[PDB]
Write a protein that binds this ligand. Structure first.
Ligand SMILES: *[C@@H]1O[C@H](CO)[C@@H](O)[C@H](O)[C@H]1NC(C)=O
Lengths: 52, 170, 106, 170, 170
């Protein structure tokens, strides 16, 4: 009762602001869309060019 | 990237620059000094956080339950439901991968852009008083002391004063 | 004598994928695919009914297990695997349709 | 933008320039003038109406009614139909949003591009007889009358026939 | 394109060039000679083949049969199935057309980009020993032979050796 959510499945609750999930394809509620990929990394920085 | 500054004519970046993203590092008579540029650093971070805020935000469409787990539904409508859901999950997996990829490509080609914009602002500051080294460094002809470099940073550098000397030092 | 322009970098890069290259290394990236699950039913601000052994259809007919839910009222209705819609054996016709009705019934 | 010309080193735009999109503004002994450039304005608007022409056209696929408005269909198949339709609606909303976003970004970066291409053409015409102002202007050391400028705007300017006069004016 | 090198100020390309993609073509006292530049060629090539690698691969996700070609299914569920499949087919057609159109735009602008990066590389090798043509040529001032040219195309060119002559010949 203390925790607050709006997306459920047989295994629990999906609390997340991210647009995707890899938890349960059948999840109900206001849910991020289910995708096959384990991880999709979005770049938030420039190319790392260090000293060789 | 597309602008050939990062991983381009600037061979590598400085692992010690922690003040910000892009900056200057001068060598002059009074010793070495490295210090960032807030203007373009913020110009890039504002854009990256724009991508994020636009992306990490939820839709208000709520979906209900149409099949059953404990008491399986009829076989034909179940195979149709599963078929539909697999086609949708395929679409979304593709949209997600393509999205992340193109936002990363545009992010790198954006930071490259902001770097080339900074270098091409310094270039127009130092009109004829300095020559492009080639490794993103500017060779100043006149005597630029640790207070003159600050004028180069603040965009307050008046080239008319030093033009007399540096021109002749051709 | 000179002044140099440049950017930053770190010794611990994070690898991402682009249109044109797989595994290009960048400074800082984030995750777009959530895997952090909460192993509970979070119900803050929702009238919930944990049916348990009572089946959802048994709230209409009223076998013993469902006595406590004859006139339930909820915003979130939680079914369990141990639910039993009947005591005397039988089954509803179009039972999943009536289930979908009662799930959005309040 | 990516190229740093529009809202970059160019401070702002000329609200009066209804003659075109980009243009030249000259200041010399005979006054101040503003004219347009058909080449770059056209090479831009061609591209933009190219986008419009690629997007503003409909598909030839025809759909049919598969439920009923006055006599609601069976509950289960209606809930399946609804779930599928709402899923499609979500997908098309996403594709539309990202389409407009990524086409607008590339529109603006395209305009930036055309501006920077013009400002580099005018330099390669205006070889060392002129220096880069910094605000997107060209400071010429020799004397250009109105016919001189109109010869720059036609790509007819010859730098040799003004080479000496200006070079000595370093 | 976005960078105005290919189909920009460089009037056109060289059908005679079959060694690589971008190259150099010089006309000095010892006659004309032209040969290709490998670093830019291999850059653009490795990027375009990166796009192909990301595209040319297939999903492992397997789809079953939900209808029948010989014995048509029940009419209502068949119309729901055909409606779903038509909607998905429509979606994938849109995703495909958009993907190809944007990968082409980006490809073209990327080759344009690599050209601009080579031109701007040489422009910084020849610091003050040459002047900007305007059509992608570099008007050298000192007597560069068929060995000093090969020192350009290896970047081994030292500008300080040949600075005096080209400077004076301004
Ligand atoms: C399906 O949605 C429509 C409007 O979107 C609604 O009128 C109809 O009642 C819904 N069907 C069911 C079974 O809820």
């Amino acid at each position: 009762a203390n925790c607050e959510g709006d997306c459920y499945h047989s295994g629990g609750t999906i609390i997340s602001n991210l647009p995707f999930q890899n938890i349960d394809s059948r999840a109900v509620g206001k849910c991020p869309r289910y995708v096959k990929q384990r991880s999709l990394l979005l770049a938030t920085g420039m190319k790392n060019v260090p000293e060789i | 990237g597309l602008f050939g500054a990062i991983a381009g004519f600037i061979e590598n970046g400085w692992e010690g620059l922690i003040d910000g993203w892009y900056g200057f590092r001068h060598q002059n008579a009074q010793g070495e000094g490295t210090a960032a540029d807030y203007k373009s650093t913020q110009s890039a971070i504002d854009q990256i956080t724009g991508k994020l805020n636009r992306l990490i935000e939820k839709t208000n469409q709520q979906f209900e339950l149409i099949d059953n787990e404990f008491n399986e539904v009829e076989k034909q409508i179940g195979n149709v439901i599963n078929w539909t859901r697999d086609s949708i999950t395929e679409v979304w997996s593709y949209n997600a991968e393509l999205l992340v990829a193109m936002e990363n490509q545009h992010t790198i080609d954006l930071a490259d852009s902001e770097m080339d914009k900074l270098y091409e602002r310094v270039k127009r500051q130092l009109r004829e008083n300095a020559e492009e080294d080639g490794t993103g460094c500017f060779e100043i002809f006149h005597k630029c002391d640790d207070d003159c470099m600050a004028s180069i940073r603040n965009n307050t550098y008046d080239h008319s004063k030093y033009r007399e000397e540096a021109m002749q030092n051709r | 004598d000179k002044i140099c322009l440049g950017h930053h970098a770190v010794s611990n890069g994070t690898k991402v994928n682009t249109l044109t290259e797989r595994g290009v290394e960048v400074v800082n990236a984030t995750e777009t695919v959530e895997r952090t699950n909460i192993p509970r039913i979070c119900s803050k601000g929702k009238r919930t009914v944990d049916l348990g052994q009572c089946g959802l259809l048994g709230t209409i007919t009223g076998p013993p297990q469902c006595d406590q839910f004859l006139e339930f009222s909820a915003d979130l209705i939680i079914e369990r695997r141990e639910g039993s819609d009947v005591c005397y054996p039988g089954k509803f016709v179009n039972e999943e349709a009536l289930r979908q009705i009662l799930r959005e019934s309040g």
